[PDB]
Write a protein that binds this ligand. Structure first.
Ligand SMILES: *C(=O)[C@@H](NC(=O)c1cccc(O)c1O)[C@H](O)Cc1ccc([N+](=O)[O-])cc1
Ligand SMILES: *C(=O)[C@@H](NC(=O)c1cccc(O)c1O)[C@H](O)Cc1ccc([N+](=O)[O-])cc1
Ligand SMILES: [Zn+2]
Ligand SMILES: [Zn+2]
Lengths: 399, 399
């Protein structure tokens, strides 16, 4: 169960010293990554997020206005052009505020939920880099929610359900939630921090969530929540973060018209659910040890002939499955059928369709699974509908 | 017909002096962009491309090994970390060679088609920047084909059909093709350049393509083809490029085992069909003057009530359409029905469903189009199937 070894074994990705901490996503690893995006998007639709894309670098003077420059300038890559210094973005937050600031906002536009699969780069020490887990370039399932003070409970609610709904899809049902203890140096009124804390307290009670407090210092900009999942090995992984923010929107001159016709500053809620998706993919690789569920499997079906007689039939099938939206490949090589079956089993391909002479005469296929289960000869349309149901439901298990 | 004005009008994107030449993609502009990706992917599947994602910067020493450093170092952004200099990638080609170089390749793996929606950055002079057309950061529908010498005709064929098939989807059927005149300084044998030229000549004849020659100097690395489309204003736009390459693969130590069991260098074919997609989107915006075809429209349907009686019904409809895969929005505001209809017309929303009292009692909706056409009251399921057909077929015109 080593995601770097399995990654090489299944041709998912690679890295090289030329781009330390930066992932070369091969076709099959990119297939997994994009199937995560579709999943995230399907929940974005459900909970009504926008999806945006911001620029990959922005003026240094802007980053200095966030206040992150002072604290974290050592972690940001910098480049210049025409005697102007830019920073490769390490976070998507300022960009989203930039999009919010276009056009006059009123209370009726809030809550405004803005999501981005944003690529960010940090200048991590090369010695801390480890596979997909600790990298320099990553994409996170980022989002930022702009809302009034009164909306914090309802919004945090939505983040909480989102965390548990998504993690369960992967088979993660053991989840620890840690609140944060407020620092002595913080931004925002004492009054502002205690109403928000009541909103957080009421939201956690509502979802019946036992929370611990985090023993270290919290964030200076607002209350913060972290979610930790446990995998089948009972290992703890911290992925979800919900970070209330009373500092960035005032610093970047965000405002909206309230019902009282007054320019208030909106509250910002930063939230990721999976965290870094490169990291998350590593986690899934170890969780399943390379036996990806059908919907995540890079290749879902391989169809094989026994001799060249059945070769035309297989190509028919491969196209027929591919029009049905199944990642399928035809294996017409000059190897014997046991060799093909063992080989595609070692490569963790979920289903394997064998086409002997009786299969062609019959309009069916012999089905073997990557666990060695023999499901017998089944109608072609039957295999298609069953496979589609498993894909769309994102079943963790097979037939 | 100004894509920058329409872009502001339809809330597609924006730019600011903080990130010159770099696009802030708002929700609705990002919806168009992602609907282009899906379209490109659907043709990737048809012509069997891989899709990969490479790292966003790589060691300077690598870029020096391509030979592009000397010619074009002024156009590449540079940054460093730990006394090592990196370049923000201005092209995806070296990265794809890196993925190809993992693992032993033999003739049986070629042609190997590798596609990427790769973000690239060039340090263009700030005075040349213009809207979406001339930018510093762009994504192109990039691909690279690794193939034997004998495969050039069949591969170039595939690029040609790809160009015409894709352009026609948008209503571009006037297309000029320009071959290139070979430079005096070039890389590769005299023999190598003349067999490839026969492959190009035979492929162009096969598709009945009248070609001109480009009056300037060609590329030093291989024969090159450019495709120009003409829009409804008879303006010429150059988007497609097919660039044969005999220099990069030898320079980056790519090789494969031939049938003769000899390590040959593969031929590289670089091809983009739309070019920069930010640029291409600008082109479509002017081509349609903001009346995007339904499949590209950011919001495809708006459903409206006439008073709050019909308000519950509209919300039912909006969800029903949204489960059918339609980008739909409900307009329950306290404005009169003509105001809503004019407003969503000015925003070029294709279809508009009005729900009066008779509509709720009947299980139908009144349909008006953004051209002012009154299609009458229709069954709800009827509107759904018709809309789905227009979307999946990517019809340039409405009902
Ligand atoms: C404040 O921005 C706080 N943000 C987060 O913790 C956060 C979590 C999940 C999703 C999003 O979008 C978030 O912003 C934190 O201070 C952000 C931050 C931490 C570290 C660095 N760094 O370069 O080491 C930059 C920003
Ligand atoms: C050689 O790489 C040649 N490539 C292309 O013209 C090309 C066209 C379409 C798609 C792809 O992937 C291509 O590589 C050209 O020399 C590449 C190149 C041109 C300009 C710059 N620049 O930074 O000004 C860099 C690379
Ligand atoms: Zn954030
Ligand atoms: Zn290229």
């Amino acid at each position: 169960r080593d995601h770097r070894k399995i990654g090489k074994q299944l041709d998912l990705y690679h890295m090289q010293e030329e781009a330390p901490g930066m992932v070369f996503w091969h076709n099959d690893g990119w297939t997994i990554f994009r199937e995560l995006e579709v999943f995230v998007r399907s929940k974005l639709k459900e909970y009504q997020y926008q999806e945006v894309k911001g620029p990959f670098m922005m003026d240094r003077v802007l980053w200095e206005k966030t206040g992150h420059w002072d604290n974290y300038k050592d972690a940001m890559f910098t480049t210049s052009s025409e005697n102007r210094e830019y920073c490769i973005k390490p976070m998507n937050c300022p960009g989203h505020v930039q999009i919010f600031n276009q056009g006059l906002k009123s209370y009726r536009d809030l809550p405004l939920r803005m999501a981005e699969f944003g690529s960010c780069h940090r200048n991590e020490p090369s010695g801390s880099l480890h596979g997909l887990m600790r990298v320099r370039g990553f994409t996170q399932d980022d989002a930022h929610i702009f809302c009034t003070e009164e909306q914090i409970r309802d919004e945090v609610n939505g983040c909480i359900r989102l965390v548990y709904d998504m993690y369960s899809t992967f088979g993660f049902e053991k989840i620890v939630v840690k609140l944060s203890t407020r620092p002595e140096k913080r931004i925002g009124s004492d009054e502002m921090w205690d109403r928000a804390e009541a909103d957080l307290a009421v939201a956690l009670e509502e979802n019946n969530i036992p929370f611990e407090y985090q023993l270290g210092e919290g964030a200076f900009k607002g209350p913060k929540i972290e979610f930790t999942l446990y995998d089948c090995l009972d290992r703890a992984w911290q992925c979800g973060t919900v970070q209330l923010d009373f500092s960035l929107p005032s610093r970047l001159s965000a405002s909206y018209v309230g019902e009282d016709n007054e320019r208030k500053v909106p509250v910002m809620i930063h939230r990721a659910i999976l965290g870094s998706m490169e990291r998350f993919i590593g986690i899934l690789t170890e969780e399943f040890a390379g036996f990806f569920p059908t919907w995540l499997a890079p290749v879902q079906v391989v169809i094989m002939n026994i001799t060249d007689s059945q070769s035309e039939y297989v190509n028919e099938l491969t196209q027929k499955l591919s029009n049905a939206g199944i990642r399928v490949k035809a294996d017409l090589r000059n190897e014997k059928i046991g060799f093909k079956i063992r080989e595609h089993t070692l490569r963790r391909v979920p289903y394997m369709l064998v086409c002997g002479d009786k299969e062609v005469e019959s309009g069916k296929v012999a089905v073997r699974t990557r666990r060695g289960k023999d499901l017998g000869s089944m109608d072609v349309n039957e295999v298609i509908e069953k496979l589609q149901q498993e894909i769309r439901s994102r079943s963790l298990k097979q037939l």
